[PDB]
């Protein structure tokens, strides 16, 4: 129950000291050079040898350099160590650990984007340096300098990203332990009851990466920190330790800290007015990032001499390859979408998983679960899923049920099924070490468990007491795991059961930093140090593949929630921010956290509604529902000591405010699902910060308490302070904005003050958009499946609007073969049209045929033009038929906009149409 500070992490100490030395020496030079005559360029790839000078004799070691220029416009830079590629080192303690630098992070993370640009070309190439042109129309440049090695990445007439400009490149080369630079952290190190045997010695890789002319950087979740990341080298308002990524189970984590949490995505972006760039540091080991805001001059300067403000970052990882992608944008969308091409888009979710999820530690019996389910219906509060935490098990053995408390799990399951609701059951990677437990027998006899430094089976303490851990790095373990989840094997589960993966950092209660020893061995004989941040992801991968098919002929979308994660985990399911606390500061903090998830390419994120630890006041709980309806993943959860707080227990009038928030979420589900579709199509974030939506607006850059929802133009700013009855929203631009609920015109960019009592959600509509909703409330999202849609057409300054709507069966992979509806809606010049979003042509399966009776029935035009007054019909054309529908026009009145409503449109949602107004 204690965490290394940066001084207690030996390689973090060494790398920070490397920086101290470089930054305060007389013209320090990085002792790294390209031997230019080893250099060659062909078919988008530079290759050379970097020679590192390792002492004052001028002795060198060889560090192979690859620079790839990819068809996307992304560059990749990789540096390995030739001695280790060749096995020409010797490990201590007779370790069987691998000698080479871990190089399988690509294979877990990268799924596309790797095609080389044959059109990239050397432009200039003297004996000191070369410049390669690349990217679209050859407008990107990388200047590689030989001696000392550096790279400058350019576009639009300037450097944007520099490698090694401050000279902090550090590859710790292999060296023996001999007798006669401080070496006291090179070998064994001790912390948290444990001693790391360190069989390879020092092997970190680090680099300074400068964002030239950028004042704001973003990313590297997960941290309780602002969206715009802080400096880390001390000073007023700054942190003093670097941001850390080392997935860990951190009990009662605190606010506003660079300390590591449960997952890590080593992806950073930098944004200024109309320019974006980014890097992705692909390394699965413990990683720290120092951030300082500085100037583009390395020297002391004369009075009055100007320098560009520059964010200097210093990245270092315990082991592995130095392996970095460089993204030159120029837009926020460009960066995220290229990142998603490399590491994966958001998986198509089970549609139900966008609804409201009801959980706590624990619902104590099948009867407790059935009672909660009935009470939600009794109090008219919609929900989709109820969740079973660890107490459903028999003595913390996974794949069992406590048959005292959970006597009829199938019956419970069927009750949920009657309203198309689901059940989620927790399954963790620690397998109880006990007898009469076939799962642990098989884990052992198939050799599927994680091992110690000497190859024996690792054993440690978690919820079941003594336990072993599945090694999901091993394909054979993943394939075995798959077998355990078939409905015929995992008795008591059925088609509406899905899975929660927890404790997959991995959390080991008597381990150092509550995790595994660094010298544990995984499949391939990698050390745990090599792969630690990938561990959670391997486990979620295993569970995802298990849910694709759990009986013959089934092929469907998994739902898996994870705690620990890495780059790529967006392909596998959802995350939440772990064990937060029932307090106002944590409510406020949840929004910048969830946003940082999205801009780092894993948007399917949320935080526990109400807070995990403690007991929220009624007003805190109420406001948390109003925030939580904007989390892509929306779940209430509560610690074992917290009082029962199922939402109907709050009492009136809170119950009503809570139900209204739930119903708002449900009514917007068509639009929410469409936002997930775009996340799937090209990694577009689900909720979007102001730097993403409005890159032209400098004042937007740091803002992290408001956001847009997908493609709807809905701008939300939830209330997150105690006792507040107004809210100040930053209006990003000159478009017209309208209150969602009252249609009041909210009164160019600037701060608007709005009324926001407890019962009110601050939600505005931007002009220029169309979004879909479903107005009929229902008990769950499944009972909405066949209901009609309302389109809301929000008109701005230009009398134009556009938007879209994606629908499919929510469950299958039939969308891969075209079995879906995706409409683009355009309003222009008194006409609203619907066309296929991609412009497709023809063959209809069952689901699509059934959608022929599901209609758009209502259209609301907000800001309807005065010319429409007294016209009482519109004309509708679709599929070579024509008819009239009634429209009522409502004039502007007081602060409220004019609005018109078309009634009984009567058009099937899958059909092209044109509606002519005025």
């Amino acid at each position: 129950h204690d965490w290394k500070k940066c001084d207690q992490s030996g390689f973090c100490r060494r790398n920070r000291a490397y920086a101290d030395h470089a930054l305060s020496a007389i013209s320090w030079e990085s002792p790294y050079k390209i031997a230019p005559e080893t250099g060659s360029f062909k078919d988008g790839q530079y290759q050379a040898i970097i020679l590192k000078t390792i002492n004052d004799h001028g002795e060198t070691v060889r560090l192979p350099l690859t620079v790839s220029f990819l068809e996307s416009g992304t560059a990749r830079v990789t540096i390995d160590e030739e001695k280790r590629q060749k096995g020409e080192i010797e490990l201590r303690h007779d370790s069987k650990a691998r000698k080479e630098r871990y190089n399988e992070a690509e294979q877990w993370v990268i799924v596309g984007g790797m095609t080389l640009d044959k059109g990239a070309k050397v432009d200039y190439e003297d004996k000191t340096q070369m410049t390669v042109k690349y990217g679209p129309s050859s407008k990107f440049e990388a200047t590689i300098k030989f001696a000392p090695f550096s790279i400058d990445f350019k576009r639009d007439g300037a450097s944007h990203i520099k490698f090694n400009d401050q000279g902090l490149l550090n590859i710790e080369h292999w060296r023996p332990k001999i007798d006669p630079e401080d070496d006291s952290t090179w070998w064994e190190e001790s912390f948290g009851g444990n001693t790391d045997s360190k069989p390879r010695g020092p092997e970190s890789v680090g680099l300074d990466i400068s964002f030239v002319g950028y004042e704001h950087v973003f990313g590297i979740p997960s941290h309780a920190s602002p969206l715009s990341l802080k400096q880390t080298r001390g000073g007023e308002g700054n942190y003093n330790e670097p941001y850390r990524m080392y997935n860990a189970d951190v009990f009662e984590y605190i606010l506003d800290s660079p300390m590591t949490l449960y997952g890590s995505i080593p992806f950073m972006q930098a944004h200024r007015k109309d320019s974006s760039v980014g890097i992705f540091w692909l390394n699965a080991a413990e990683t720290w990032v120092d951030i300082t805001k500085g100037k583009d001059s390395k020297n002391p300067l004369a009075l009055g001499v100007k320098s560009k403000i520059t964010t200097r970052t210093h990245w270092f990882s315990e082991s592995g390859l130095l392996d970095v992608f460089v993204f030159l944008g120029p837009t926020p969308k460009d960066i995220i979408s290229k990142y998603a091409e490399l590491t994966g888009t958001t998986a198509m979710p089970q549609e139900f998983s966008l609804g409201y999820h009801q959980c706590r530690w624990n619902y104590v019996s099948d009867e407790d679960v059935k009672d909660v389910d009935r009470k939600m219906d009794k109090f008219n509060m919609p929900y989709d899923v109820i969740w079973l935490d660890i107490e459903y098990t028999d003595e913390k053995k996974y794949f069992t049920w406590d048959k005292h408390s959970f006597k009829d799990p199938i019956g419970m399951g069927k009750q949920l099924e009657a309203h198309g609701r689901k059940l989620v059951t927790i399954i963790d990677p620690h397998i109880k070490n006990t007898n009469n437990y076939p799962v642990v027998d098989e884990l052992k006899s198939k050799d599927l468990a994680v091992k110690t430094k000497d190859g024996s089976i690792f054993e440690g303490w978690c919820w079941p007491g003594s336990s072993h851990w599945i090694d999901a790095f091993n394909p054979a373990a993943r394939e075995w795991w798959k077998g355990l989840f078939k409905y015929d094997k995992f008795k008591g589960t059925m088609e509406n059961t899905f899975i929660w993966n927890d404790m997959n950092e991995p959390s080991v209660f008597n381990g150092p930093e509550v995790t595994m020893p660094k010298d544990n061995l995984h499949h391939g004989n990698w050390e745990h140090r090599d792969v630690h941040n990938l561990n959670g992801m391997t486990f979620q991968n295993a569970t995802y593949h298990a849910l694709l098919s759990r009986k013959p002929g089934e092929h469907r979308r998994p739902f898996v929630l994870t705690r620990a994660f890495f780059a790529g985990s967006q392909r596998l399911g959802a995350m939440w921010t772990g064990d937060n606390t029932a307090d106002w500061g944590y409510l406020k903090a949840s929004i910048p956290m969830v946003l940082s998830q999205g801009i780092a390419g894993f948007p399917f994120a949320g935080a526990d509604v109400g807070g995990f630890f403690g007991n929220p006041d009624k007003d805190l709980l109420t406001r948390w529902y109003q925030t939580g309806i904007f989390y892509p993943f929306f779940r209430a959860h509560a610690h074992i000591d917290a009082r029962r707080r199922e939402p109907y227990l709050t009492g009136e009038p809170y119950n009503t405010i809570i139900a209204a928030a739930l119903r708002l979420r449900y009514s917007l589900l068509p639009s929410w699902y469409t936002a997930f579709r775009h996340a799937h199509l090209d990694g577009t974030p689900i909720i979007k910060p102001m730097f993403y939506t409005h890159p032209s607006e400098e004042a937007g850059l740091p803002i992290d308490d408001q956001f847009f929802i997908g493609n709807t133009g809905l701008l939300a700013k939830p209330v997150t302070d105690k006792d507040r009855t107004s809210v100040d929203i930053w209006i990003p631009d000159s478009e017209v904005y309208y209150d969602y609920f009252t249609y009041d015109i909210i009164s160019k960019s600037k701060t608007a003050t709005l009324d926001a009592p407890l019962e009110k959600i601050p939600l505005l509509m931007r002009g220029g958009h169309v979004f879909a909703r479903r107005d009929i409330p229902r008990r769950s999202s499944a009972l909405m499946k066949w209901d009609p849609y309302t389109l809301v057409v929000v008109l701005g300054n230009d009398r134009k609007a556009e938007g879209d709507l994606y629908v499919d069966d929510g469950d299958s992979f039939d969308y891969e073969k075209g079995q879906y509806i995706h409409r683009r809606f355009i309003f222009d010049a008194n006409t609203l049209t619907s066309a296929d979003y991609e412009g497709r042509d023809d063959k209809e399966g069952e689901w699509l045929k059934k959608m022929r009776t599901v209609n758009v029935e209502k259209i609301i035009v907000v800001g309807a033009p005065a010319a429409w007054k007294g016209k009482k019909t519109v004309t509708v054309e679709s599929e070579g038929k024509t008819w009239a529908a009634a429209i009522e026009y409502n004039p502007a009145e007081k602060s409220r906009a004019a609005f018109a409503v078309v009634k009984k449109v009567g058009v099937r949602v899958g059909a092209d149409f044109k509606i002519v107004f005025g």
Binding site: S667, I776, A782, K785, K858, N890
Partner: protein, 131 residues
């Protein structure tokens, strides 16, 4: 006579030609607009037999509604619910938001008439005579 109308509101569903909204009688409709799945009365009274006025509810997101007693959709509908006559057992109201949702709500609607549109294929039995 229109579907979902209880005995004590029967008298309001009568003319030939026009329907006056029961609780908000300054709005008058054509009688073809009863149970046409458009919510045309701001008290909900033109849809006794469908789910289309179920958003007229104090629990649902508030939207402007000219002619509503409150001025918005946050209002108490005139009708108590959708009436299931349940011949052979005993009549009762169910909530409009249980109407045509694909779920047979047999406890209070044993005749199965809540799912008369067969949303998504659903066919409900008439279970009244058994219960």
């Amino acid at each position: 006579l229109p579907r979902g109308v209880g005995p004590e509101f029967a008298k309001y569903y009568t003319s030939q030609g026009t329907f006056t909204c029961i609780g908000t009688p300054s709005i008058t409709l054509s009688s073809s607009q009863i149970n046409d799945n458009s919510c045309d009365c701001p008290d909900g009274s033109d849809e006794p037999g469908t789910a289309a006025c179920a958003h007229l509810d104090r629990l649902s997101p508030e939207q402007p509604l000219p002619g509503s007693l409150t001025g918005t959709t946050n209002t108490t509908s005139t009708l108590p619910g959708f009436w299931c006559a349940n011949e052979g057992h005993i009549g009762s109201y169910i909530p409009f938001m249980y109407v045509n949702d694909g779920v047979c709500d047999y406890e209070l609607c044993c005749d199965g008439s809540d799912e008369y549109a067969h949303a998504g294929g659903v066919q409900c039995e008439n279970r009244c005579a058994a219960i």
